[PDB]
Ligand binder design. Structure first.
Ligand code: LL4
Ligand code: LL4
Lengths: 188, 194
């Protein structure tokens, strides 16, 4: 029933650890899920739709975790960046394949865009509240500062996870981001 | 002869303004450059090699311009020094948006493009780190993060942020605000004690 959908998703994430989406066939996903190819087509219209569902789940998991946190200043930001570091860090294969699919899937590009706008708006609201209580100085427009900081974390977190040359080592990427966020949000 | 190569490059950059590489054929590039298809193949093995060459020229132009800046005293306050350096990339890539966009896309599918980008990123990060170290050495910047790791995150920020702005991504910093936004983050993060 639903456990069949879940088996297809788990198979896909498992195979994506090994190869790109280009080198995984519906036949591949059907076999690992223990179903036939036409049964697979009952649950998903394409291998692309499988990835989109995985990414949606990972992105919603980071988002929910950030809402949970939301509901010292350096430590507050570190805890928030850490939600993304851990969530996407725990699903590296999906992260890497989802980021690649942005260039070829409008639904993936729109999903990413929607959540980026949400995370940027949350970041700017917190900066504004810090400015309101007199802990942060009124320097750049908060939304513009939030946008560049979130774009930084996207590129840098994901370069690290994929082992890009160049990238910050994964064991140093959290301290690196937190320094840049704290000095740029609080720095006069 | 060489003017044929340059006409093929100019044709490709022009067509990239309106359509992606996938919607440009070799026939299109030959037609715009005033040559036949087999003549095109004399100059380039593929439409991919044309783009790789365009990107190589753009990336080398930014790089030569950063070298020119670096070799001057250029005496200026610290914020102004970083602004002038970020401005080289803002102007150079900003002047070739279609090539920048297509070349960033082609990183996914071309090992030669991926390796080109990677080579210059490492060079620009190393120059940034060396400048941060010299600043630390003279006592203008505090010793906070490892200079190379700070340099890496800052350059990766500029790559994603400049290129999101150029492409009009949602979300992105408006192109008229992006220079000021980057310079603020570089200055506070390089000089900020906290
Ligand atoms: C763009 C993704 C890959 C990374 C997103 C990221 O690193 N963030 C986005 C929002 C963040 C934020 N945290 C908060 C906090 C509120 C209360 C504790 S953290 N508000 O916004 C932290 C950094
Ligand atoms: C990854 C590309 C798009 C980043 C380009 C970038 O904005 N840079 C790279 C290096 C830059 C740098 N400037 C300098 C200067 C030396 C003397 C005046 S500026 N050293 O490193 C400034 C920012």
């Amino acid at each position: 029933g639903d456990d069949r959908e879940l088996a297809i998703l788990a198979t896909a994430e498992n195979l994506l650890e090994d190869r790109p989406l280009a080198d995984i066939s519906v036949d591949d996903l059907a076999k690992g899920a223990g179903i036939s190819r036409p049964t697979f087509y009952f649950y998903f219209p394409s291998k692309e739709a499988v990835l989109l569902t995985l990414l949606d789940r990972v992105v919603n998991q980071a988002d929910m975790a950030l809402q949970t946190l939301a509901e010292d200043r350096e430590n507050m930001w570190r805890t928030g960046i850490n939600v993304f570091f851990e969530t996407f860090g725990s699903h590296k294969a999906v992260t890497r394949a989802g980021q690649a699919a942005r260039a070829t899937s409008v639904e993936v590009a729109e999903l990413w865009s929607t959540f980026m706008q949400k995370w940027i708006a949350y970041t700017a609201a917190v900066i504004d509240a810090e400015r309101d209580r007199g802990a942060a100085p009124r320097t750049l427009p908060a939304h513009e500062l939030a946008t560049a900081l979130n774009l930084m974390n996207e590129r840098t977190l994901f370069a690290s996870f994929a082992g890009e040359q160049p990238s910050v080592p994964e064991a140093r990427v959290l301290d690196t981001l937190v320094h840049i966020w704290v000095t740029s949000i609080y720095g006069e």
